[PDB]
Symmetry: C4
Subunit: 320 residues, 4 copies
């Protein structure tokens, strides 16, 4: 039963030249969509304060991915797509299982053919209703790569991949502004979740996202080390200029709101399993991305992985 | 050796409103119960008639504290005939306590539950008290505690108790563990005592140590039939404890029944805290029930009766 | 590797006021004891004459600190003849300490207990000192320490000590552990050493690390014959240490006997704290005994002698 | 997986009757001989100073001098302080510029007979080959090389020419390696493993980082470290570098990681900056560390530091 804080990665003998030699790009072929991916497999979360068009514009420059939140209008999308044609390939449109959610998703995907990824997102990915929903989206968009979640165990990973999802989002309760564990007692240690879900998905030639619980670049590296194909970040990317969330200047300091998508704040804006925080303002996100990628490059260097693809193979966890 | 904090519930494949009601048939009293098996503690700041009136609307249970007068009881009962079915009158082992109790149960036949409550449920003296109350009130359902191990749960049920209160030292204003070194991790206590009670077709209350709706779910998931709450229900309009406005903030006193504050009022194993004021308890009750419904949904339980069967605990650091 | 915080006592079925008195017969001095076997530590802020006067009224014991003149002792004895039966005169090693001790014992024959106390009870030098004291005072009961393991308990008892003082590094104002890395978890120390002592019909004092009555209970439950308290008795009226009123609050100094503060007063392995003022020690003694009585009640012990017998520890 | 906090040393019977903290070593590859008290001031720019070297020499301690002195500053120091040169190392990373600077120092100051080759990652084949090259170039100088945390790499570095292997990745007080990269190793375990590896080849190790009190230094020696290197414990003194800052009525000194942004700016981060309350003259700190370790030796029955690891039994806490 391992969380990120329970482990370190062992350094290992390497034959690398320097650490500039390290390639964080991955190449993936998705099981069901048959589509191909090339990029740095870190994803801005589809939270309304994180998965913003402003976030996507910066992250595109580092070949990072954005799961866009589900509170932009079609006109907002078409304006963005018009102005930022070269930002559309590492971008996903998001939906819950609502008929209204699905409608809106369908209009974006019709209006903006360059968007080739769908993020289907529920708190409880273990319901039959979500499984059937994944199957239907798969029937409606056979060439769109589907991310689906969330779950924390292998049986549910297999079933979602066999139902038509390409990439399974892994994490229940680990998120920085999540209160699922306190309100319900349900969840799963994230690193253990990733290890189990990674094996289960890879057995079927599918993929996973480690979604939530990362608070430093070291955690991101551990999740990749444990076999995650992608890592999704909320709190690390909140509080930047490009982030959503109200700017609040009080008592001589600057803060940004950050809140869970099932917080009372979110539910009012548009039973609670999320909370609100005020994050000290962080400035521009590009400095944060550079820190994250630098940290992972060094991890690779320490374990002798010349490419991120080699990281999980070269990873031996030490229990602390 | 587990506390609530040592575990998470594993989510499970479901095919599914969750029904949080339970139906019980009590081994010794032979009476039946239907309701939401969450109980307001018989603390003087929690088990109040004002608490009872709201909890009734949600079909929750109130163990009333032992510091109301007969006139006060008679008053409440005459104006609130429909709260009476999910109410227990409480007593310690005292002569005076038993007398107060008897007067209440005589004058208010609608009260069909008795909460017999001492800090140390392991004393022969307490065992003999339970027997005496079972003789006196053959048709009343008896809750009796507290204990933390199976052999004592067995002994108490065979002595006539229907429902055993489980917990020594986990409570939010309890100081037993610091004062005496005595106690038992609550989750382990519940698991063990639940197996013991259920072997005799009896029942248990997880009494103490819940500070969030997830804890309540873990107690139920571990096999508790009922969960008893003090701290989570303290601090509301309906709660007792003086309202204190200081430094532009509002607080409510909450204190252990063996605290120096309680003893003065009416050797210490309880403390006093000031709780920031919480407003109406109704909103807390919804938050709790909403939490537990979601637990049920996550593990594929259509009703609370299924939760323990569908619970697989995951050990967390 | 257990500390007090690592365990709880399991309650047990009972058929029961609890007697906190114990009777002991000492292996080497051949003397007998009846009393409540909680001891005030021989720290200059705790093992005071004022502390002894209160503790006597509850039949508790006082290991007097080693920084009173003989004239001070003579005056206390003259004025307080009934407070002398549960008192020890304390000493470190070396000529001057031995000489002081002798003078006190000679002047005040009612003092029948000797507390021999060094940081490291594992040295040959200490063993030989225990031997000398025993030979000089063959009817005095000897407390000697400190140690944490069974081989050393045995050697000290065979060298002539009656009661072995157990604990290295657990004290609230001790810094041995940070300074030297040396020590031993106190509860495991107690269990091990008690078995060693009791095999020779000797006795132990659990010395250090109790910060609440539950801790005292655990120490006895693990088989400690006596429990010695410093920090729990510091900060009272009867305690030494300067009363300091500052920022509208009252504090008392409390400090390790190897703190720079102590060394200066008369290589540090102790520290200084300021303890909020606690008032009269009487109320604290009652809270302590009240808590231990309730432990006995929870486990079915009618007498303190029955507590280790009826103790089952739960790892928490 | 052990850290210094996870253990205590068991006391033991002794017949001692002051403890000698001097050691003598004969180095595997350089064939040179050492005698002194084997505690080393780290080669951080705030710790490995000429002013530090001057005080530490009085106690027979060792200084790994930082990389940011000029050639004239070295030559001035050596001219004015001929008696300090026996117990210092000149330092270098693997960059062309570092190594050149070092060559110039060794050419100017023939009394400097120790070299400290110091990278964050001693596991690279690039570092291994650089060690071989420095050994070829300076066959009579004693070479300290690191950092690593496992035996295979200790052996390889020793076989490649290094005399003394610097052990520790991530434990340092102002290191952020573990947060930025997830990479590391518990320091006590690293020391035990690496000491065994080194000693089997007749080499030696330095436990580098993670000591915050004398007890930690004693534990590292007790685990088999030949030397212990200190950054944090020596920061914040008069003799230390770092700016003296008087603010809010108090005195502080900067202390920062050599891969911190502060250090990089000054001359992708894996170190941080702190302000350490000013400690005064380092001599009193040195007396406290030595007194602590002498006292550990006394408790375990070691007349001499050379006997400590042999008399050490760790108890897990
Ligand atoms: O209200 C919520 N409740 C529980 N989890 C949430 C909520 N909102 C967002 N999350 C999850 O937390 C993730 C971000 O985790 P973080 O990086 O630790 O902040 C998102 O990708 C979601 O999966
Ligand atoms: O004074 C006391 N000392 C120890 N436990 C107490 C005291 N008063 C009430 N309790 C217990 O604590 C429970 C409430 O626990 P809570 O929900 O954690 O606050 C009550 O139902 C009692 O079993
Ligand atoms: O300076 C010292 N260093 C280490 N231990 C000390 C020192 N002074 C007193 N002690 C011990 O601490 C014990 C009291 O511990 P306490 O009850 O935890 O405060 C005394 O009985 C001594 O054994
Ligand atoms: O920027 C840094 N990042 C990581 N480790 C560092 C850095 N700077 C110095 N160190 C290490 O930390 C050691 C000192 O550790 P300390 O004694 O715990 O302060 C040095 O000898 C280096 O090995």
């Amino acid at each position: 039963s391992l969380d990120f804080k329970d482990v370190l990665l062992r350094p290992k003998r390497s034959t690398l030249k320097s650490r500039s030699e390290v390639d964080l790009t991955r190449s993936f072929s998705f099981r069901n969509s048959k589509q191909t991916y090339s990029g740095v497999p870190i994803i801005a979360a589809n939270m309304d304060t994180v998965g913003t068009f402003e976030m996507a514009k910066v992250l595109c420059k580092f070949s990072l991915f954005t799961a866009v939140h589900k509170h932009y209008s079609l006109v907002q999308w078409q304006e963005f797509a018009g102005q930022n044609p070269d930002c559309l390939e590492h971008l996903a449109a998001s939906s819950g299982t609502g008929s209204s959610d699905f409608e809106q998703l369908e209009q974006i995907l019709e209006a903006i053919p360059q968007v080739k990824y769908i993020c289907l997102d529920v708190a409880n990915g273990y319901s039959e209703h979500f499984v059937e929903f994944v199957k239907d989206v798969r029937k409606r968009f056979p060439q769109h790569t589907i991310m689906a979640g969330n779950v924390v165990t292998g049986e549910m990973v297999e079933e979602l991949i066999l139902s038509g999802a390409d990439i399974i989002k892994v994490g229940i309760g680990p998120g920085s502004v999540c209160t699922t564990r306190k309100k319900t007692g349900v969840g799963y240690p994230q690193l253990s979740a990733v290890m189990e879900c990674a094996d289960a998905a890879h057995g079927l030639k599918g993929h996973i996202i480690s979604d939530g619980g990362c608070s430093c670049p070291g955690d991101v590296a551990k999740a990749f080390g444990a076999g995650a194909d992608f890592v999704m970040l909320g709190g690390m990317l909140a509080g930047h200029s490009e982030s959503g969330g109200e700017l609040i200047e009080r008592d001589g300091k600057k803060y940004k709101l950050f809140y869970g998508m099932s917080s009372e704040m979110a539910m009012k804006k548009y039973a609670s399993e999320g909370k609100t925080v005020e994050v000290p303002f962080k400035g521009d996100v590009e400095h944060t991305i550079r820190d994250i990628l630098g940290g992972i490059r060094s991890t690779c260097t320490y374990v002798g992985a010349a490419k991120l693809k080699e990281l999980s193979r070269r990873t031996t966890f030490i229990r602390v």
